[PDB]
Design a protein around this ligand. Structure first.
Ligand SMILES: [Cl-]
Length: 202
């Protein structure tokens, strides 16, 4: 039994959210730094598998357990609308719409959760799809990030979407090299965030 990329299933939800938590702090574990790290998958993983599970893929460890993922959306403007209309009501009880400016790191992420319009960056308009990709530390440096990425790009291209972007923390230079090796170019660095993109054709 060997590790392999496969489509996400609903029984991968727990593992996907945990991978997200464990990589959300500029690639590193968010648990030491946040009171409720569940806000991360609530903003950056769960809505994708809720709304567009057909674009979610996992790295299976060979024993059935997801140990990495790639997920995303075919169309960012539609995703933002759907996120507000369909997703936010499902999490607003647990994470209420903010009434005052963020006081804590936790409240900063809740602010992002409640502003999916953050995704409407003018410079990425020509790259309609976007993604998040993460692997648990023990699974990095094994070629599996590439396997995930190529699977996701093929899925987008098959759906007729020609271009994709992503965001990354600018200071995270190892991530920058990872994306560079996967054929991404710099779109813009507006903020601690860099946007990268490429065409989805192989
Ligand atoms: Cl990052």
């Amino acid at each position: 039994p060997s590790p392999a990329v496969r489509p996400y299933r609903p029984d991968d939800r727990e593992a996907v959210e945990d991978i997200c938590v464990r990589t959300a702090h500029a690639g590193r574990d968010s648990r030491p730094h946040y009171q409720d790290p569940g806000v991360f998958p609530a903003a950056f993983a769960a809505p994708y598998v809720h709304l567009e599970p057909e674009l979610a893929f996992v790295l299976d460890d060979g024993a059935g357990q997801a140990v990495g993922y790639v997920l995303g959306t075919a169309d960012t403007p539609r995703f933002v609308a759907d996120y507000r209309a369909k997703w936010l009501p499902l999490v607003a009880g647990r994470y209420p719409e903010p009434r005052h400016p963020p006081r804590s790191p936790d409240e900063e992420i809740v602010a992002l959760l409640h502003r999916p319009e953050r995704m409407l960056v003018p410079e990425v308009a020509a790259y309609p799809a976007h993604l998040h990709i993460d692997l648990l530390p023990d699974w990095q440096g094994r070629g599996y990030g590439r396997a995930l990425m190529e699977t996701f790009l093929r899925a987008l291209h098959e759906r007729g979407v020609a271009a994709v972007h992503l965001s990354m923390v600018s200071a995270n230079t190892p991530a920058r090299a990872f994306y560079d090796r996967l054929g991404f170019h710099e779109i813009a660095v507006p903020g601690p965030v860099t946007y990268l993109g490429r065409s989805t054709a192989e």
